[PDB]
Scaffold this motif. Structure first.
Motif, mmCIF file in Angstrom:
data_model
loop_
_atom_site.group_PDB
_atom_site.id
_atom_site.type_symbol
_atom_site.label_atom_id
_atom_site.label_comp_id
_atom_site.label_asym_id
_atom_site.label_seq_id
_atom_site.Cartn_x
_atom_site.Cartn_y
_atom_site.Cartn_z
ATOM 1 N N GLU A 118 0.922 -1.123 0.000
ATOM 2 C CA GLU A 118 0.000 0.000 0.000
ATOM 3 C C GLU A 118 0.965 1.174 0.000
ATOM 4 O O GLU A 118 0.610 2.301 0.344
ATOM 5 C CB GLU A 118 -0.867 0.047 1.260
ATOM 6 C CG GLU A 118 -1.866 1.202 1.224
ATOM 7 C CD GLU A 118 -2.463 1.547 2.579
ATOM 8 O OE1 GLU A 118 -3.187 2.562 2.660
ATOM 9 O OE2 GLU A 118 -2.216 0.813 3.559
ATOM 10 N N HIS A 119 2.205 0.871 -0.379
ATOM 11 C CA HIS A 119 3.279 1.850 -0.455
ATOM 12 C C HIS A 119 2.719 3.164 -0.971
ATOM 13 O O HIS A 119 1.995 3.188 -1.964
ATOM 14 C CB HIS A 119 4.377 1.343 -1.394
ATOM 15 C CG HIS A 119 4.981 0.039 -0.971
ATOM 16 N ND1 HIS A 119 5.912 -0.632 -1.734
ATOM 17 C CD2 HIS A 119 4.795 -0.712 0.140
ATOM 18 C CE1 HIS A 119 6.274 -1.739 -1.111
ATOM 19 N NE2 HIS A 119 5.612 -1.813 0.029
ATOM 20 N N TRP A 120 3.047 4.256 -0.293
ATOM 21 C CA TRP A 120 2.537 5.553 -0.701
ATOM 22 C C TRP A 120 2.925 5.843 -2.145
ATOM 23 O O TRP A 120 3.754 5.144 -2.730
ATOM 24 C CB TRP A 120 3.075 6.650 0.217
ATOM 25 C CG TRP A 120 4.369 7.237 -0.230
ATOM 26 C CD1 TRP A 120 5.513 6.564 -0.531
ATOM 27 C CD2 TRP A 120 4.664 8.630 -0.404
ATOM 28 N NE1 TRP A 120 6.505 7.448 -0.881
ATOM 29 C CE2 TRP A 120 6.011 8.724 -0.810
ATOM 30 C CE3 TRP A 120 3.920 9.809 -0.254
ATOM 31 C CZ2 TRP A 120 6.634 9.951 -1.067
ATOM 32 C CZ3 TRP A 120 4.542 11.031 -0.511
ATOM 33 C CH2 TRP A 120 5.886 11.089 -0.913
ATOM 34 N N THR A 121 2.316 6.878 -2.707
ATOM 35 C CA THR A 121 2.587 7.283 -4.079
ATOM 36 C C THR A 121 2.580 8.807 -4.142
ATOM 37 O O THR A 121 1.723 9.453 -3.538
ATOM 38 C CB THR A 121 1.527 6.709 -5.014
ATOM 39 N N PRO A 122 3.538 9.404 -4.869
ATOM 40 C CA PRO A 122 4.603 8.723 -5.613
ATOM 41 C C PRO A 122 5.716 8.195 -4.707
ATOM 42 O O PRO A 122 5.489 7.893 -3.534
ATOM 43 C CB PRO A 122 5.099 9.809 -6.562
ATOM 44 C CG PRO A 122 4.976 11.044 -5.714
ATOM 45 C CD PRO A 122 3.621 10.866 -5.059
#
Lengths: 167, 168
Positions: B60-64
């Motif tokens: 669910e790694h943040w973006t960007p």
């Protein structure tokens, strides 16, 4: 007159003594729970959790009870996310009969030196708001009241409540 | 949904990343002079002057940028002449896009455990007197306002002045 030096395991008895004696001129009182065994294990063991400077007087100016330690300062290093390592002065007391020959002022000098040698950007410490004499003193040495400036208040959660959160 | 764990040397870039984000979020205008090298030497070199817990999320790694560390907590041990070793919570932060997931409450739990296993009598921390919410979040949780009760104020003497006292 008197020499300020870093405590050694052999000074713990004196330090507890000054801590108990410090716990009298204080008002929030609450008798001391620490033991000499704690001061040793926590300051002169694996990893020191506190450091102490001690005021030692010559065999001539000893305590009526026969003591060469007439003062002490307790400190440790803290960390700030913005600037890094800091020196934290936990407490510093100087026996009544010996409280007028610059011992305390010398202690502050030695702490300031520890602060330089250990790359501490600053030294933090607490002052009771009612102790106006102590407030102006530190004010004269360039201290800033962060609580008044930024609104910081000291909070605590004791063992009882930590046990609930933890379990 | 996520996992709180002790930080490692590899998480230092993440920690600083989150500190710089905590700073922006801050109301005070404090510039972060702390560098990754600092966090490394002071945290993973010989004697750690601080300890960090990090909040890690799955893919669910943040973006960007894409990171797995969404939050952190910084703490260290202090000492009290009356009762001994204490746990001192310096700070904790959870990325805006990740708050409201319970990370902030789970973090406090791990700290409580560290305090339990490390023989600490209490856990101390600072709260801005204007942050009514935090004050409430900690009270009812058992927290007591020591500045209120005993009048304690935080004082500081910066380097320039420490230098004077050290030399003069």
């Amino acid at each position: 007159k008197f020499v300020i030096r870093p405590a050694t395991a052999a000074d713990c008895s004196d330090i507890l003594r000054l801590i108990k004696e410090l716990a009298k001129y204080e008002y929030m009182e609450e008798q001391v729970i620490l033991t000499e065994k704690d001061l040793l294990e926590d300051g002169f063991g694996e990893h020191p959790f506190y450091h102490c400077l001690v005021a030692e007087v010559p065999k001539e100016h000893w305590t009526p009870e026969g003591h060469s330690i007439v003062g002490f300062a307790m400190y440790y290093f803290t960390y700030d996310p913005w600037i890094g390592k800091l020196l934290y002065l936990e407490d510093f007391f100087v026996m009544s009969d010996y409280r007028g020959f610059g011992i305390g002022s010398e202690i502050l000098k030695n702490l300031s030196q520890v602060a330089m040698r250990c790359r501490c950007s600053s030294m933090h410490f607490l002052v009771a708001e009612w102790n106006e004499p102590s407030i102006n003193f530190y004010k004269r040495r360039g201290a800033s009241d962060l609580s008044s400036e930024e609104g910081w208040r000291l909070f605590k959660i004791d063992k009882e409540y930590l046990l609930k959160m933890a379990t």
